[model samples]
Target chain A: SHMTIEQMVDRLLSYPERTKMQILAPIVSGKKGTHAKTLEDIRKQGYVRVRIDREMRELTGDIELEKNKKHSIDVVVDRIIIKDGIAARLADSLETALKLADGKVVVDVIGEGELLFS
Target chain B: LVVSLRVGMEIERNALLRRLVDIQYDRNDIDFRRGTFRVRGDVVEIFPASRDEHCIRVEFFGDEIERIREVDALTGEVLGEREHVAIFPASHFV
Candidate 1:
């Protein structure tokens, strides 16, 4: 795939309901949660689309939606939960976030596995 | 994924822009950023992804390239001239 991580994210954001559902319908595996200590400047360069507390929000310049919610600011981002339903499409985003965060981002794939991006 | 440019190369302006876009280079008219291409009249300035400190300026007389040079990223000063240069993909995934 020649799609850049940002392009992949843009395309994922535009996926129709049916296509989105189809893409996220598989890969059911994971522990309950993930926690880690990441770099301090990650929020500025990395991307986020998981939850803060319980509210659904995200942060990324690739798309225009939930950016107003700066959920990771000040908070240590103890645990980021990627619900099972959104995993397939969100996997790349998580991976890219981990890349920019220097292998320090943690993602809990509700039913799949917890990722520390090692 | 390389676009070879020589001093006398002939490439349509629109074609060059489209090729840049296909390679995932963003169009920035004001200033050059990494992985961006800008056009002003007969000149096109591009900051390729492989380069971090400098950008390439391609001057075209109509459809034929007049000159190619490496320019300072911030100051727009000509660093060196190139008889030929190859532009690689501006995005890793592309």
Candidate 2:
């Protein structure tokens, strides 16, 4: 079988030097609750509202938007902001985020001005 | 979403550790909280997501689970002892 997500995460984190790892939650347009579910899920996973659509602010709960109220927004996890520890420090949280997104989350590991992993 | 754990259960130490992380348990060096755990030596403390106040303390002897107890998450006080406990994942996504 191909490398499991955890294995890939471990491999990426095992690099001897520090790098930048970006974790992005795929954006999709659907009903209010549909996207909200993912947002709320990640929020509980220690994520803050990073790049939410303006309309989504009041779009809380099970209530739907009025008159074709579907909106497209970037629902990235706020934890992606690098800290003092660099990308290696983010491995645990990012790994959980990717798993929570069912591998839909994208990870970009860039080091020495080169992209590591396809 | 639930893993049955009991005292005197035999299992691999690393396997259990991996299982804890696989189930969305964060490794913590400080106090236990919901979805967090601490592995110090052979003792493992886990704050189950389903619980609010107390957490579980699992004592391991090598690969064999020796004891399971319910302890205060903050103070580390022994609340009660449990012979069997069901640990739910820290997150449903797991």
Candidate 3:
């Protein structure tokens, strides 16, 4: 099983020798949370507008796109809302939203009008 | 799955019970009997009961239970626990 976030943080803090080795030779002892590239940059690009229902599941709204694709935009709606105790983490929310939006743009450019936006 | 044995007849009975209990515990399953001894979890189930020498029945489920013929519970002869799966990253080539 993958180590929990708390466990990963504890290992990095308590094990100085391991931490140094990890930083020096990341390939041997891979760094934590290094799976995705430009995660923070993706989050800053745009916000995901979500509507929460009584069931606590998030319903996504239409994707808002930038004209230049490089400028940061304000979140028109609440991106992350916890109905009960559980909510998707900031990184997870960003990944899901961006991927969906990107897919829509790709379909539109490819002239696949039959392709449904998920 | 059901192995019936006589109650007064003892074919290494305690040993069998221990082996079964050890297997259940190793699997992280609970083994207890207020009215009936029921072992449940993963894919193992063991039901052992004895009324008379001629009336003993042991039911074993899952593939792991076939390893031992009998077990001694009081003696605490524990079987090896199941191994946990190791996680690896997708990027790791080897």
Candidate 4:
């Protein structure tokens, strides 16, 4: 058994003196507003438009070369499960949780905890 | 990319504004878009840097989030109340 989502968030915020804490949450990706990212993010943090397009083709599997067509560029470091111990600031947990709520995983914050892996 | 606000939370108005600016919400004559705000006396109406209800009027009891209420989009009329609301950035980053 582990902490509820709200409880975990409350723990991180209330214990500000502590540096960080680990909680397992569901892993969620932020690559899509219309759909969840499975392999599409290979393009979000895609190769540079200036690079030889074929370079990324061989080095990276699929890539996005057009900058204007994108929303914003960012590399992945990200999400959730009750995986045992992932660390983040109180504030940061909410950021990832927000993404999850926006359809990354959209779990019940206060319901029965789900089966999650590390 | 989001703000989880609770009553009795003491967040500085200026600091909150600065954070919104860092997220690229330019101030407007009135808060009609993300990153815009209008402050008067102890009442502050702001459109957070996320997909909010257009505007949230936060009343302060001096540095405290004394009250949080939602408002209408076009007319800015008061729209019931909420105990908490998540604040997310439009582009979605922290």
Better of 1 and 4 by TM-score: 1
The per-residue C-alpha lDDT of model 4 at residue A106 equals 25
Best by lDDT: 2
lDDT of each: 0.51, 0.55, 0.24, 0.43
Clashing pairs in 4: A24-A81, A24-A82, A24-A83, A25-A80, A25-A81, A26-A80, A26-A81, A27-A79, A27-A80, B2-B87
| Worst lDDT 10-window in candidate 4 chain A | A45-54
Ranking by DockQ: 2, 1, 4, 3
Task: Report the Cα lDDT for candidate 3.
Answer: 0.24
Ranking by lDDT: 2, 1, 4, 3
TM-score of each model, in listed order: 0.43, 0.43, 0.16, 0.38
- At residue B8, what lDDT does model 4 achieve? 85
In model 1, the Cα lDDT at residue B24 comes to 86
For candidate 2, give the lDDT of residue A39.
52
Clashing residue pairs in all predictions, respectively, total: 6, 0, 12, 10
lDDT of 3 by residue, A3-27 (tens): 3334333332332221111011001
* DockQ, candidate no. 4: 0.02
User: Could you give me the TM-score of model 3 versus the true structure?
Assistant: 0.16
TM-score of chain B of 1: 0.90
- Over 4 Å off, model 3: A1-118, B1-31, B34-47, B52-66, B77-94
- Docking model 4 quality class: incorrect
lDDT of 4 by residue, B1-93 (tens): 455676788775555556656665565644466657654334456676555455776665434677777764445456667677665554554
**Docking quality class, candidate 3:** incorrect
lDDT digits (tens) for residues A27-73 of candidate 1: 11121222222211322322222334443444332323243333232
